[PDB]
Coordinates of C-alpha atoms in Angstrom, one line a residue:
Chain A
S1 CA -20.8 -30.2 41.5
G2 CA -20.3 -27.6 44.8
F3 CA -17.8 -28.4 45.3
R4 CA -14.9 -29.7 43.0
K5 CA -11.8 -32.0 43.8
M6 CA -8.9 -30.3 42.8
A7 CA -5.5 -31.6 42.2
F8 CA -2.5 -30.2 42.2
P9 CA -0.7 -28.4 38.9
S10 CA 1.8 -31.5 37.7
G11 CA 3.8 -29.7 35.1
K12 CA 7.2 -30.3 37.7
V13 CA 6.9 -34.1 38.0
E14 CA 6.3 -34.8 34.2
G15 CA 9.3 -34.1 32.7
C16 CA 10.0 -36.2 35.8
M17 CA 8.7 -39.6 33.9
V18 CA 10.2 -42.0 32.3
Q19 CA 9.4 -45.6 30.7
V20 CA 11.4 -48.4 31.9
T21 CA 11.5 -52.5 30.3
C22 CA 12.8 -55.4 31.3
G23 CA 12.2 -57.9 28.9
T24 CA 8.7 -57.7 28.2
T25 CA 7.2 -56.0 31.1
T26 CA 7.4 -51.9 30.8
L27 CA 6.6 -49.7 33.5
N28 CA 6.6 -46.1 34.3
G29 CA 10.0 -44.5 36.4
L30 CA 10.8 -41.1 38.3
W31 CA 14.2 -39.3 37.0
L32 CA 15.4 -37.3 39.7
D33 CA 19.0 -36.0 39.4
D34 CA 21.1 -39.1 37.5
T35 CA 19.0 -41.7 39.7
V36 CA 15.6 -43.2 38.3
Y37 CA 13.6 -44.8 40.1
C38 CA 10.8 -47.6 39.4
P39 CA 9.3 -51.0 40.7
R40 CA 11.4 -53.3 41.3
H41 CA 8.5 -55.9 40.1
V42 CA 10.0 -55.1 36.9
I43 CA 12.1 -57.2 36.8
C44 CA 9.2 -60.1 37.4
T45 CA 8.2 -62.5 34.2
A46 CA 4.5 -63.4 35.3
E47 CA 5.5 -66.4 37.0
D48 CA 8.9 -64.5 38.5
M49 CA 5.7 -63.7 40.1
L50 CA 3.9 -66.0 41.0
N51 CA 6.1 -66.4 44.1
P52 CA 10.0 -64.1 43.2
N53 CA 12.9 -64.1 45.4
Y54 CA 14.2 -60.5 44.1
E55 CA 17.9 -60.3 45.5
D56 CA 17.8 -63.9 43.1
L57 CA 15.6 -62.2 40.5
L58 CA 18.4 -59.7 40.3
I59 CA 21.8 -60.6 40.1
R60 CA 20.8 -62.5 37.5
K61 CA 20.9 -59.4 35.6
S62 CA 23.0 -56.5 34.8
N63 CA 23.0 -53.0 34.0
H64 CA 22.8 -53.9 29.2
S65 CA 19.6 -54.7 31.1
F66 CA 17.3 -52.1 32.1
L67 CA 16.3 -49.6 29.1
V68 CA 15.1 -46.2 29.8
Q69 CA 14.3 -44.0 28.0
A70 CA 12.7 -40.4 28.2
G71 CA 11.2 -39.2 26.0
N72 CA 12.3 -40.1 22.6
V73 CA 16.2 -40.2 24.6
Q74 CA 17.9 -43.6 26.1
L75 CA 19.0 -43.1 28.8
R76 CA 21.9 -45.1 28.9
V77 CA 22.5 -47.0 32.6
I78 CA 25.0 -47.3 34.6
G79 CA 24.3 -49.2 38.0
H80 CA 21.0 -51.3 39.8
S81 CA 20.4 -51.8 43.6
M82 CA 17.8 -53.1 45.7
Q83 CA 16.0 -50.3 47.7
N84 CA 13.6 -52.2 49.6
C85 CA 10.0 -52.8 47.1
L86 CA 12.2 -50.2 44.7
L87 CA 15.0 -49.9 42.1
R88 CA 17.7 -47.9 42.0
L89 CA 19.0 -47.3 38.4
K90 CA 21.7 -45.5 38.5
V91 CA 21.5 -43.3 34.8
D92 CA 24.6 -41.7 33.1
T93 CA 22.6 -38.2 32.2
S94 CA 21.9 -36.7 35.2
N95 CA 17.9 -34.6 34.4
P96 CA 17.2 -31.2 33.7
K97 CA 14.2 -30.6 34.9
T98 CA 15.1 -32.1 38.1
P99 CA 13.1 -29.9 40.6
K100 CA 13.4 -29.0 44.4
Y101 CA 11.8 -32.3 45.9
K102 CA 11.1 -34.5 49.3
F103 CA 10.1 -38.0 50.0
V104 CA 8.0 -37.5 52.5
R105 CA 5.6 -40.5 53.9
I106 CA 1.7 -40.1 54.0
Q107 CA -0.2 -41.5 57.1
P108 CA -4.0 -42.8 56.1
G109 CA -6.4 -40.6 55.6
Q110 CA -4.3 -37.5 53.4
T111 CA -5.1 -36.8 50.2
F112 CA -1.8 -36.2 47.4
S113 CA -2.9 -36.4 43.4
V114 CA -1.1 -38.6 41.5
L115 CA 0.4 -38.0 37.4
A116 CA -1.1 -41.2 35.8
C117 CA 1.4 -42.8 33.0
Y118 CA 1.5 -45.8 30.3
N119 CA 4.9 -46.6 29.1
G120 CA 6.5 -43.0 30.0
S121 CA 4.5 -41.1 29.5
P122 CA 1.7 -37.7 31.8
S123 CA -2.1 -39.1 31.2
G124 CA -3.0 -37.5 33.2
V125 CA -3.7 -36.1 36.4
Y126 CA -5.7 -36.8 40.2
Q127 CA -6.6 -36.3 43.1
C128 CA -7.2 -38.9 45.7
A129 CA -6.4 -40.4 49.4
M130 CA -5.5 -42.9 51.0
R131 CA -8.0 -45.3 52.9
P132 CA -7.7 -46.4 56.4
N133 CA -7.1 -49.3 55.0
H134 CA -3.7 -48.6 53.4
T135 CA -4.7 -49.0 49.5
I136 CA -6.2 -46.4 47.0
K137 CA -9.0 -46.3 45.1
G138 CA -9.5 -45.8 41.2
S139 CA -8.9 -47.8 38.4
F140 CA -5.3 -48.0 36.4
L141 CA -4.5 -50.0 33.8
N142 CA -1.5 -52.9 32.8
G143 CA 1.0 -50.6 32.3
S144 CA 0.3 -47.4 34.6
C145 CA 2.9 -49.6 37.5
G146 CA 6.0 -46.6 39.1
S147 CA 3.4 -43.5 38.0
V148 CA 3.3 -41.6 41.3
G149 CA 1.9 -39.1 43.9
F150 CA 2.6 -35.8 45.5
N151 CA 1.5 -32.9 46.8
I152 CA 3.4 -30.1 46.1
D153 CA 4.7 -27.0 49.4
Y154 CA 5.3 -23.7 47.0
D155 CA 8.0 -24.4 44.9
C156 CA 8.9 -27.8 46.2
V157 CA 7.3 -31.2 44.4
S158 CA 6.9 -33.8 48.3
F159 CA 6.2 -37.3 46.6
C160 CA 4.1 -39.5 48.9
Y161 CA 3.3 -42.5 46.3
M162 CA 4.1 -44.6 43.7
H163 CA 1.8 -47.5 41.9
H164 CA 3.1 -51.1 42.0
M165 CA -0.7 -53.4 42.5
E166 CA -3.7 -54.1 42.3
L167 CA -5.2 -56.7 44.4
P168 CA -7.3 -58.9 43.2
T169 CA -10.2 -57.4 44.2
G170 CA -9.2 -54.5 42.3
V171 CA -7.6 -51.9 45.0
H172 CA -4.3 -50.3 44.4
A173 CA -1.9 -51.1 46.4
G174 CA 2.2 -48.6 46.8
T175 CA 4.9 -47.5 48.4
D176 CA 6.5 -44.3 49.4
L177 CA 9.1 -43.8 47.3
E178 CA 12.2 -45.7 50.0
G179 CA 10.3 -48.3 48.6
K180 CA 8.8 -48.9 51.7
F181 CA 4.8 -50.6 51.3
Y182 CA 1.6 -48.6 52.7
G183 CA 0.0 -51.5 54.3
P184 CA 0.3 -54.9 55.1
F185 CA 1.3 -55.6 51.7
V186 CA 4.2 -57.0 49.0
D187 CA 5.1 -57.3 45.8
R188 CA 4.1 -61.4 45.6
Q189 CA 0.7 -61.7 43.7
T190 CA -0.3 -64.7 46.3
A191 CA -4.2 -64.0 47.4
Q192 CA -3.3 -61.0 49.4
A193 CA -6.1 -59.5 51.8
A194 CA -6.7 -55.3 52.9
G195 CA -7.9 -55.6 56.5
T196 CA -12.1 -53.8 56.0
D197 CA -11.9 -50.4 55.0
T198 CA -13.9 -47.3 56.8
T199 CA -14.7 -43.8 56.3
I200 CA -12.3 -41.0 57.4
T201 CA -14.5 -38.8 59.5
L202 CA -11.2 -36.5 60.0
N203 CA -12.4 -35.3 56.0
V204 CA -16.1 -35.3 56.5
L205 CA -16.1 -33.2 59.1
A206 CA -14.0 -31.1 56.3
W207 CA -16.2 -31.8 53.5
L208 CA -18.8 -31.0 56.0
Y209 CA -17.2 -27.8 57.1
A210 CA -17.1 -26.7 53.4
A211 CA -20.7 -27.5 52.4
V212 CA -21.9 -24.3 54.3
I213 CA -18.7 -21.8 53.8
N214 CA -20.3 -22.1 50.5
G215 CA -24.2 -21.7 52.5
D216 CA -25.4 -25.3 52.2
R217 CA -26.1 -26.0 56.3
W218 CA -29.8 -27.3 56.8
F219 CA -27.7 -30.0 58.3
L220 CA -26.8 -28.6 61.2
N221 CA -28.4 -28.9 64.6
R222 CA -28.8 -27.2 67.7
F223 CA -27.2 -30.5 69.5
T224 CA -24.0 -31.2 70.4
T225 CA -21.9 -34.7 71.1
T226 CA -17.7 -35.9 73.4
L227 CA -15.3 -38.0 71.5
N228 CA -17.0 -41.1 74.0
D229 CA -20.4 -40.2 72.4
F230 CA -19.6 -40.3 69.3
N231 CA -17.2 -42.7 68.4
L232 CA -19.9 -45.0 69.5
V233 CA -22.3 -44.2 67.1
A234 CA -18.7 -43.9 64.2
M235 CA -17.3 -47.9 65.4
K236 CA -21.6 -48.2 64.6
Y237 CA -20.9 -47.0 61.3
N238 CA -18.0 -48.7 60.5
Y239 CA -16.4 -44.8 60.7
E240 CA -12.4 -44.1 62.1
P241 CA -12.4 -43.0 65.5
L242 CA -12.3 -39.3 66.3
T243 CA -9.2 -38.9 68.8
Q244 CA -8.4 -35.3 70.0
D245 CA -5.5 -35.1 67.5
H246 CA -8.1 -34.5 64.7
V247 CA -10.3 -31.9 67.0
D248 CA -7.6 -29.8 67.2
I249 CA -7.1 -30.0 63.5
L250 CA -10.4 -28.6 62.9
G251 CA -9.8 -25.7 65.1
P252 CA -9.3 -22.8 62.0
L253 CA -12.3 -24.8 60.2
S254 CA -14.0 -23.9 63.9
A255 CA -13.2 -20.5 64.1
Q256 CA -13.0 -19.4 60.8
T257 CA -17.1 -21.0 60.3
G258 CA -18.9 -20.2 63.5
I259 CA -19.4 -23.9 64.4
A260 CA -17.8 -25.5 67.1
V261 CA -16.4 -29.0 66.1
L262 CA -18.2 -31.5 68.2
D263 CA -20.8 -29.0 67.1
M264 CA -20.3 -30.3 63.5
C265 CA -19.7 -33.5 65.2
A266 CA -23.1 -33.9 65.8
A267 CA -24.9 -32.9 62.8
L268 CA -22.0 -35.5 61.5
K269 CA -24.0 -38.0 64.2
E270 CA -27.6 -37.6 62.4
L271 CA -26.8 -37.5 59.6
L272 CA -25.8 -41.3 59.9
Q273 CA -28.5 -42.2 61.8
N274 CA -31.5 -40.2 59.7
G275 CA -29.8 -40.6 56.3
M276 CA -30.2 -37.2 53.8
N277 CA -33.5 -38.3 53.0
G278 CA -32.4 -37.2 49.0
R279 CA -31.9 -33.8 50.7
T280 CA -28.1 -33.3 49.0
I281 CA -24.6 -32.1 50.0
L282 CA -22.9 -30.0 48.4
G283 CA -24.8 -31.7 44.7
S284 CA -23.5 -35.1 46.4
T285 CA -26.2 -38.0 47.6
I286 CA -23.2 -39.1 50.1
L287 CA -20.6 -38.8 52.6
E288 CA -17.5 -37.2 50.5
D289 CA -13.5 -38.9 52.9
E290 CA -11.4 -37.8 49.8
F291 CA -11.4 -34.1 51.5
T292 CA -9.1 -33.1 54.0
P293 CA -9.6 -29.9 56.3
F294 CA -5.6 -28.9 54.5
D295 CA -7.7 -29.5 51.0
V296 CA -10.3 -27.1 52.1
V297 CA -8.5 -24.7 53.8
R298 CA -6.5 -24.5 50.9
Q299 CA -9.8 -24.4 48.5
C300 CA -10.9 -21.7 50.0
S301 CA -8.5 -19.5 50.9
Chain B
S1 CA -15.1 -43.6 43.2
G2 CA -14.9 -46.7 40.9
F3 CA -14.2 -43.9 38.1
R4 CA -12.7 -41.4 38.3
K5 CA -12.6 -37.6 36.6
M6 CA -9.2 -37.1 34.9
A7 CA -7.6 -33.3 34.7
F8 CA -4.8 -33.4 31.2
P9 CA -1.6 -32.6 32.8
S10 CA -1.5 -29.4 32.8
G11 CA 2.7 -28.6 33.2
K12 CA 2.0 -26.6 28.7
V13 CA -0.3 -24.2 30.0
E14 CA 1.6 -22.6 33.6
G15 CA 4.7 -21.6 32.2
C16 CA 1.6 -19.7 30.3
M17 CA -0.3 -17.4 33.4
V18 CA 1.0 -14.9 34.5
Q19 CA -0.6 -11.7 36.3
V20 CA -2.8 -8.3 35.5
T21 CA -3.4 -5.9 37.8
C22 CA -5.4 -2.2 36.7
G23 CA -6.4 -1.0 39.1
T24 CA -7.7 -2.0 42.4
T25 CA -8.4 -5.2 40.8
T26 CA -5.7 -8.1 39.5
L27 CA -6.4 -11.0 37.9
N28 CA -4.6 -14.1 35.4
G29 CA -4.0 -13.5 32.5
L30 CA -2.1 -16.1 29.5
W31 CA 1.0 -15.1 28.3
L32 CA 1.3 -17.2 24.4
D33 CA 4.7 -16.0 22.5
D34 CA 4.7 -11.9 23.3
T35 CA 0.7 -11.0 23.8
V36 CA -1.0 -12.0 27.0
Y37 CA -4.7 -12.3 26.9
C38 CA -7.4 -11.4 29.8
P39 CA -10.7 -11.0 30.4
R40 CA -11.8 -6.4 29.6
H41 CA -13.1 -6.4 33.1
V42 CA -9.5 -5.9 34.4
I43 CA -10.0 -2.4 33.2
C44 CA -12.8 -1.4 35.2
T45 CA -14.1 -0.8 38.3
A46 CA -17.4 -2.2 40.9
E47 CA -19.2 0.7 39.9
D48 CA -17.7 0.2 35.8
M49 CA -19.4 -2.9 35.9
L50 CA -22.9 -2.4 36.8
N51 CA -22.8 -1.0 32.8
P52 CA -20.0 -0.7 31.5
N53 CA -18.8 1.0 28.5
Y54 CA -15.9 -0.4 27.7
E55 CA -14.6 1.6 23.8
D56 CA -15.5 4.0 26.2
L57 CA -13.3 3.2 29.5
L58 CA -10.7 1.4 27.5
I59 CA -9.7 4.9 25.0
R60 CA -8.6 6.6 28.9
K61 CA -6.2 3.3 29.1
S62 CA -2.6 3.6 28.0
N63 CA -0.1 0.9 28.4
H64 CA 1.5 1.7 31.6
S65 CA -2.4 1.4 32.5
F66 CA -1.3 -2.5 33.1
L67 CA 1.2 -4.3 34.6
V68 CA 1.8 -7.5 34.0
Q69 CA 4.1 -9.7 35.8
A70 CA 4.7 -13.1 34.9
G71 CA 6.1 -15.1 38.1
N72 CA 8.6 -12.3 40.1
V73 CA 9.0 -10.7 36.3
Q74 CA 7.0 -7.5 35.4
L75 CA 6.9 -7.3 31.8
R76 CA 6.9 -4.5 29.8
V77 CA 3.0 -3.8 27.7
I78 CA 3.4 -1.6 24.9
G79 CA 0.7 -1.6 23.7
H80 CA -3.1 -2.7 24.1
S81 CA -6.0 -3.3 22.1
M82 CA -9.8 -5.5 22.1
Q83 CA -11.2 -8.3 21.2
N84 CA -14.6 -9.3 21.5
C85 CA -15.1 -9.7 25.2
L86 CA -11.0 -10.0 25.6
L87 CA -8.0 -7.0 26.5
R88 CA -4.8 -8.3 24.0
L89 CA -2.2 -6.5 25.7
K90 CA 0.9 -6.9 22.9
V91 CA 4.6 -7.0 25.3
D92 CA 7.8 -6.1 24.2
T93 CA 8.8 -10.5 25.9
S94 CA 7.5 -13.1 23.8
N95 CA 6.7 -16.3 26.2
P96 CA 10.0 -18.6 25.9
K97 CA 7.7 -21.5 27.4
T98 CA 4.6 -20.4 24.8
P99 CA 4.1 -24.4 24.1
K100 CA 2.6 -26.0 21.0
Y101 CA -1.0 -24.5 20.3
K102 CA -4.9 -24.2 19.0
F103 CA -8.2 -21.7 19.8
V104 CA -11.0 -24.1 20.1
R105 CA -14.3 -23.0 20.6
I106 CA -15.9 -26.6 22.1
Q107 CA -20.0 -27.2 21.9
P108 CA -21.8 -27.8 24.8
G109 CA -21.9 -30.9 26.8
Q110 CA -17.7 -31.1 26.0
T111 CA -15.6 -31.5 29.0
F112 CA -11.6 -30.3 29.4
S113 CA -9.3 -29.4 32.3
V114 CA -9.2 -25.7 34.4
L115 CA -5.9 -24.5 35.5
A116 CA -7.3 -22.6 38.2
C117 CA -5.0 -19.7 39.0
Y118 CA -4.6 -16.6 41.5
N119 CA -3.1 -13.3 41.3
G120 CA -0.8 -15.4 38.7
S121 CA 0.0 -18.1 40.0
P122 CA -1.1 -21.9 39.3
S123 CA -3.6 -23.3 42.2
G124 CA -4.9 -25.9 41.3
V125 CA -6.6 -28.4 37.7
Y126 CA -9.8 -29.3 37.4
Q127 CA -11.8 -30.9 35.4
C128 CA -15.0 -29.8 34.7
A129 CA -18.0 -29.5 31.8
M130 CA -19.4 -27.2 29.6
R131 CA -23.6 -27.3 30.9
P132 CA -25.7 -26.7 28.0
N133 CA -27.6 -23.9 29.0
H134 CA -23.6 -22.4 28.7
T135 CA -22.3 -22.9 31.7
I136 CA -20.0 -23.7 34.1
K137 CA -20.3 -25.8 37.7
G138 CA -18.1 -24.9 40.6
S139 CA -16.1 -22.9 42.7
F140 CA -14.2 -19.6 41.8
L141 CA -12.4 -16.7 44.1
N142 CA -11.7 -13.6 44.2
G143 CA -9.4 -13.3 41.5
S144 CA -9.8 -16.2 39.8
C145 CA -11.2 -14.6 36.8
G146 CA -8.9 -15.1 33.5
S147 CA -7.9 -18.8 34.1
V148 CA -8.0 -21.3 30.7
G149 CA -9.7 -23.9 30.4
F150 CA -8.3 -27.0 28.2
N151 CA -7.6 -29.9 26.0
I152 CA -4.5 -31.6 24.3
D153 CA -4.0 -33.2 21.7
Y154 CA -0.5 -35.1 22.3
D155 CA 1.3 -32.3 22.4
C156 CA -0.5 -29.2 20.8
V157 CA -3.1 -27.0 24.0
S158 CA -6.4 -27.2 22.4
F159 CA -7.6 -23.1 24.9
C160 CA -11.0 -23.5 25.0
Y161 CA -12.1 -21.2 27.9
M162 CA -11.4 -18.1 29.7
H163 CA -13.1 -17.8 32.8
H164 CA -14.6 -14.1 33.4
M165 CA -17.7 -13.7 35.4
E166 CA -19.7 -15.3 38.3
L167 CA -23.3 -15.0 38.0
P168 CA -25.4 -14.1 41.1
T169 CA -26.4 -17.5 41.2
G170 CA -22.6 -19.1 41.9
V171 CA -22.5 -20.4 38.9
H172 CA -19.5 -19.4 35.8
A173 CA -20.1 -18.7 32.8
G174 CA -17.1 -16.8 30.1
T175 CA -15.3 -17.0 26.8
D176 CA -13.5 -18.4 24.0
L177 CA -9.7 -17.4 23.3
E178 CA -11.8 -15.1 20.5
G179 CA -13.4 -13.2 23.5
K180 CA -16.1 -15.0 22.3
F181 CA -18.8 -15.4 25.2
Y182 CA -19.9 -19.3 25.9
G183 CA -24.0 -18.1 25.9
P184 CA -26.6 -15.6 25.5
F185 CA -24.3 -13.7 28.6
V186 CA -22.6 -10.3 28.6
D187 CA -19.4 -9.0 31.4
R188 CA -21.9 -6.2 32.4
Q189 CA -22.8 -7.1 36.2
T190 CA -26.5 -7.5 35.5
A191 CA -29.2 -9.5 36.8
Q192 CA -28.9 -11.8 33.6
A193 CA -30.0 -15.2 34.3
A194 CA -28.6 -18.4 32.5
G195 CA -31.3 -21.3 30.8
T196 CA -33.0 -24.6 33.0
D197 CA -29.9 -27.1 33.4
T198 CA -30.6 -30.2 31.1
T199 CA -28.3 -33.1 32.0
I200 CA -26.2 -34.8 29.0
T201 CA -27.5 -38.0 27.6
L202 CA -24.7 -38.7 25.6
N203 CA -21.8 -38.2 28.8
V204 CA -24.7 -40.1 30.9
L205 CA -23.7 -43.0 28.5
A206 CA -20.8 -42.8 27.7
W207 CA -20.3 -43.3 31.9
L208 CA -22.5 -46.1 32.1
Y209 CA -20.8 -47.8 29.0
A210 CA -17.5 -47.1 31.8
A211 CA -19.3 -49.2 33.8
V212 CA -20.0 -51.6 32.7
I213 CA -16.1 -51.4 31.1
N214 CA -15.4 -52.1 35.0
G215 CA -17.3 -54.9 35.4
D216 CA -20.8 -53.4 36.9
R217 CA -23.9 -54.3 34.6
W218 CA -26.7 -54.8 37.6
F219 CA -28.7 -52.0 35.2
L220 CA -28.5 -53.6 31.7
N221 CA -31.7 -55.2 31.1
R222 CA -33.5 -57.1 27.9
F223 CA -34.9 -54.6 26.3
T224 CA -34.3 -51.8 24.0
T225 CA -35.9 -48.6 23.1
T226 CA -35.9 -45.6 20.2
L227 CA -35.2 -41.5 19.3
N228 CA -38.4 -41.2 19.2
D229 CA -39.5 -43.6 22.8
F230 CA -36.5 -42.8 24.5
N231 CA -36.9 -38.6 24.3
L232 CA -39.9 -38.6 25.7
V233 CA -38.9 -39.5 28.9
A234 CA -36.2 -37.4 27.9
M235 CA -37.8 -33.9 28.1
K236 CA -39.9 -35.5 31.2
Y237 CA -36.4 -35.9 33.6
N238 CA -35.3 -32.9 31.5
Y239 CA -32.3 -34.6 30.2
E240 CA -31.2 -33.9 26.4
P241 CA -33.4 -35.3 23.3
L242 CA -30.8 -38.0 21.6
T243 CA -29.7 -36.9 18.1
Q244 CA -28.6 -39.8 15.8
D245 CA -25.1 -38.2 15.7
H246 CA -24.7 -39.3 19.4
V247 CA -26.1 -43.1 18.9
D248 CA -22.8 -42.4 15.3
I249 CA -20.1 -41.4 18.3
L250 CA -21.5 -44.0 20.7
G251 CA -20.8 -46.0 18.3
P252 CA -16.7 -47.4 19.6
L253 CA -17.8 -48.1 22.7
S254 CA -21.1 -49.9 21.6
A255 CA -19.0 -52.8 19.6
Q256 CA -16.1 -52.5 22.2
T257 CA -19.1 -53.9 24.9
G258 CA -21.7 -55.8 23.3
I259 CA -24.4 -53.2 24.0
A260 CA -26.2 -51.6 21.4
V261 CA -26.3 -48.3 22.0
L262 CA -30.2 -48.0 21.5
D263 CA -29.6 -51.2 24.3
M264 CA -27.9 -48.8 26.6
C265 CA -30.8 -46.2 26.3
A266 CA -33.4 -48.9 27.2
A267 CA -31.1 -49.0 30.6
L268 CA -31.7 -45.6 30.9
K269 CA -34.8 -45.5 30.2
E270 CA -35.9 -47.6 33.3
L271 CA -33.2 -46.3 35.9
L272 CA -35.0 -43.0 35.2
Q273 CA -38.6 -44.5 35.4
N274 CA -37.7 -46.5 38.7
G275 CA -34.3 -45.5 40.6
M276 CA -31.3 -46.8 41.8
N277 CA -33.0 -47.8 44.5
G278 CA -29.7 -47.3 46.9
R279 CA -28.2 -49.4 44.1
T280 CA -25.1 -47.6 43.2
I281 CA -23.1 -47.5 40.0
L282 CA -19.8 -46.7 39.5
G283 CA -19.2 -46.2 43.8
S284 CA -22.0 -43.3 42.9
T285 CA -25.7 -43.0 43.9
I286 CA -26.7 -40.4 40.9
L287 CA -26.1 -40.8 36.6
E288 CA -22.3 -38.8 35.8
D289 CA -22.8 -36.6 33.2
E290 CA -19.6 -34.9 32.9
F291 CA -17.5 -37.7 30.5
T292 CA -17.9 -37.4 27.4
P293 CA -17.2 -41.1 24.9
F294 CA -14.0 -39.3 24.0
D295 CA -13.2 -39.0 27.9
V296 CA -14.4 -42.8 28.9
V297 CA -12.6 -44.7 25.7
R298 CA -9.3 -42.1 26.3
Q299 CA -9.5 -43.5 30.1
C300 CA -9.9 -47.1 29.0
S301 CA -7.0 -47.4 26.5

């Protein structure tokens, strides 16, 4: 890989992962201060999932109904409440490893790292992106629900995602840390379907600049284009339309590479209309769209 | 990505990263107990690098010649010695975050995670593999030298690599934590060239099993083969030859997928002799060789 996908260091998040069990259901929870957040569907049985009435299912539960374990230590839940699609469990012990943090809701196309955990313990860290249709691509196993997505800004952890479910197609859906689902999805095991996905044009452009940054500009041409002409081509190949805001965002990359934004768009346009013809870019044979302009600048500086 | 590359959680390694400076040269160091390990070339100037005499360059140095900084705290070096291509700096303070650990030398084709750091602070975590020609693929910036590669085994960190230099071709070379270079390389800025690289057959097979594990076996056929017939094809396409040990290693994957090892080899053989014809495997258009059979089993269980 001429350009590797990079995850944020996970240390600050590792110390926040716990296990929450309710009956036959066991999943991951996030312990910050004296509160443990986890998908509310932990209170559901396989049957409840077909059509759950959470407010009603929760009434039948009590503090002693939740078993929270941080490592080898069981924590005592002294309260439980529902926050949108998340279960907020109040515990009697404050997490001594709680880092400086924020809850942030990301936009489609933005990236983040996921600390995949199983039964309360960290397994690995993956870097991914929020698809335009609000789903996440990858592979999560039984018990991976509850794992979180995040970004780090110096010393502050910005949590932006918590995994909840796998859609019949195998794609993943989840919420922000306020328990609000990304997309039109709900935590019910129904026929739910994600909208047709598209390619993140802004990220593909950022990646093309990255490829140039690392000496590999065979794709660059002498043409240029405009937002109207490019978006026509974009509509054809199922690529997200480009906006002025996107062009402004690519400025820093434009300035440092000597390639005007619309000129890179002219290069992308040709690649879509002709193809790569065996030729490769950054050891890749397909146009990568999981690197944001911010990721490229961060990984290059 | 139908199957994402996964790095180990980096928390245990993060608390071990420090900065070591000697003149205009600043790079990363690993602080374990009361010892800081770093590339010995930190004592070299751009000119010394053309043809360094380390034993002689080191004699001219003293403890006060090394500036070690862990975060915001300067550590006091009370001794310095050379261990092959590593500089061993004895410090007056033992690292309170030292994890349980081991130093291990990996074999070509094996994988590990790298905690890329710059000027002593963690930047990101990447998953990679030791190429058959003993180099590492990726992109390291000025000051990234000293970053380490590792694997985690439950609660023990097995350090297996420390980055030292970028070869003229842009590939990377380094040592194990005993300071022994992987490959024929030495820490001198000369014309050094890496042997022609090949594809890690064992890993490609592991990945093909992974693809099958996740429902995607269009490539499977009704043929079989043998180590002699496959290796003939392997020799043609610059693929590492398969050994009996490799076949034995793939057993667990074979048993759980219902595909005999030699049968998967028969499928790989056809893919090399014909190609993928636009068809893809795990959202990939080229045969991935950076997942070991152990990584696949670990990521699937």
